[PDB]
Amino acid sequence: LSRYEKWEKIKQHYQHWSDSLSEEGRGLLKKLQIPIEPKKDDIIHSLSQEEKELLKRIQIDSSDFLSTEEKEFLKKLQIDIRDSLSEEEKELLNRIQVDSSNPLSEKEKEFLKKLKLDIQPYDINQRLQDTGGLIDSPSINLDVRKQYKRDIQNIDALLHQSIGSTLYNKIYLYENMNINNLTATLGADLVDSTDNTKINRGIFNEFKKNFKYSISSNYMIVDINERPALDNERLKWRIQLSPDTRAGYLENGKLILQRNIGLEIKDVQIIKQSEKEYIRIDAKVVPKSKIDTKIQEAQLNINQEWNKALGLPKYTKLITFNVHNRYASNIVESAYLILNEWKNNIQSDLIKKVTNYLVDGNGRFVFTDITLPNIAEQYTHQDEIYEQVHSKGLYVPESRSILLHGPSKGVELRNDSEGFIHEFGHAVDDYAGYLLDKNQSDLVTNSKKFIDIFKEEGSNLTSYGRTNEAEFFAEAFRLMHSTDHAERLKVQKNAPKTFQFINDQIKFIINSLV
Ligand SMILES: Cc1cc(S(=O)(=O)N[C@@H](C(=O)NO)C2CCOCC2)ccc1F
Ligand SMILES: [Zn+2]
């Protein structure tokens, strides 16, 4: 009631709390709000001459294991490295990335895999979001892992004062959000292709359809009064807190809320602000446990549903929903769609045989909104942090699992179903090689036959198909099972030796005896 009035009231409620903050608890909240960024100087200085030259040339955007932010920071490093080369050199040494696509050299990936460790910012809210709160996951340096733990414990203890039974229902809190923070997929096609000031009604129904609940595993920083959207801020959350939600007052009319809260999506509409269309999200704070309960129930249902269809013992734990972030209900809902597309597009006998092979190794299909290095099915078989990978999808042979990360975007994929089919291609590759040699299991694509076929047809299909034999097989396998016939034909057409090689590996799997 009165924007300035609302502000003043909330501030006063928290006034004593703010006055009691130590210079330590006050520096902590500042660190939480403004993460400590790596110094570009320090980084470049730590490199040797050869590494500088490598970093200088390397096709940064070619890496499939780096976030945009990490790709970008690295590109500034690249500029500074050449920030002392002729204009022509600079224009030339960058005007070839146009027709540039070269899955990096092994020696390039190794270098970047290690450099990625040195370019991380100290970001408490990101750590929590990336791990879904599972802050002991061995996805970062032990020493840094412990500092995060301490800061987080320290911040949890500061945020002890509830909003109160007087204010909760008397105030809405706000949050602007970039759609790409929940769905990088819908995000790049949910703003009307033609008129950017509008929302595509088709997608919006998509988005909305399955948006029932959301979790915050980090500390939401919310505005006491709604703020005009910035650039890519097409989501405008209107949040109602529970009488017992803990928070702290932040200068400039903001609140930091306690981590691990649950939210119930009450209404989602398309609304108009300053002549542009925005998506309004009305949410209500509820206990996380009440949402974790919906998730565990959805997990049990999907497994019982599939254990029957795939004829496995009912109690079989095949599917895991490792869900902790703000687009939670979508990840759950998405898994149903994906497994349906998978079944509607691949011979039932291929599905059963391969899925049984995974099950025999205690494999899983992991649908998640936390980064892949934090999924035990990967990390328990990858001690070296530099070899751990975050990406749209992953197949881990050692654990016979498929990991599929919801929020990210895969290379030239239309949807998550397709990422899944590609991952299943990896599993098919594994099983086939196994069938040929149970006494020395190896991947079919490691066969001399396929290797020669790769050296010949390896570049005929997707750019991503060129990365290596394994991926080429997975990409052909995916395309051979697309929902669009044209794609299925181009493989048989443009890559007949591969097509026949896969169909032959499919036939072999189907024919083998139990
Ligand atoms: C075209 C395509 C790319 C990915 S990705 O963009 O997630 N790349 C990873 C992959 O192929 N996983 O199976 C790589 C990333 C580097 O480490 C190995 C897996 C996932 C599925 C898919 F269909
Ligand atoms: Zn792959």
Swiss-Prot record:
Induction: Positively transcriptionally regulated by AtxA, which, in turn, is induced by bicarbonate and high temperatures (37 degrees Celsius). One of its GO terms (biological process) is proteolysis. Disulfide bonds: none annotated. Interacts (via ATLF domain 1) with the cleaved form of protective antigen (PA-63) anthrax toxin; interaction is required for LF translocation into the host cytoplasm. Interacts with PA-63 homooligomers (either homoheptamers or homooctamers): three molecules of LF bind the PA-63 homoheptamer to form the PA(7)LF(3) complex, in which the relative position of the N-terminal alpha-helices in the three LFs determines which factor is translocated first. GO terms for molecular function: metalloendopeptidase activity; metallopeptidase activity; toxin activity; zinc ion binding. Residues 312-507 form the ATLF-like domain. Residues 39-119 are annotated as: III. One of its GO terms (cellular component) is extracellular region. It is found in: Secreted; Host cytoplasm, Host cytosol. It is an enzyme of class 3 (hydrolase). Inhibited by NSC-12155 (1,3-Bis(2-methyl-4-aminoquinoline-6-yl)ure). Inhibited by phenoxyacetic acid bearing alpha-benzyl substituents on the C2-side chain. Inhibited by sulfonamide hydroxamate with benzylic additions at the sulfonamide nitrogen. Also inhibited by sulfonamide hydroxamates with alkylation at the sulfonamide nitrogen. Inhibited by hydroxamic acid inhibitors. Residues 18-119 are annotated as: 5 X approximate repeats. Binds 1 zinc ion per subunit. This is Lethal factor. The chain holds residues 298 to 809 of 809 of the full protein. Coiled coil: none annotated. Zn(2+) binds at residues 422, 426, 464, 471. It comes from Bacillus anthracis. Its cofactor is Zn(2+). Changing residue 423 to C/D: Loss of activity. No effect on zinc binding. Changing residue 422 to A: Loss of activity and zinc binding. Belongs to the peptidase M34 family. Residues 1-33 are annotated as: IIA. Residues 123-286 are annotated as: IIB. It catalyses: Preferred amino acids around the cleavage site can be denoted BBBBxHx-|-H, in which B denotes Arg or Lys, H denotes a hydrophobic amino acid, and x is any amino acid. The only known protein substrates are mitogen-activated protein (MAP) kinase kinases. It comes from the Bacteria. Lethal factor (LF), which constitutes one of the three proteins composing the anthrax toxin, is able to trigger rapid cell death in macrophages. Acts as a protease that cleaves the N-terminal of most dual specificity mitogen-activated protein kinase kinases (MAPKKs or MAP2Ks) (except for MAP2K5): cleavage invariably occurs within the N-terminal proline-rich region preceding the kinase domain, thus disrupting a sequence involved in directing specific protein-protein interactions necessary for the assembly of signaling complexes.
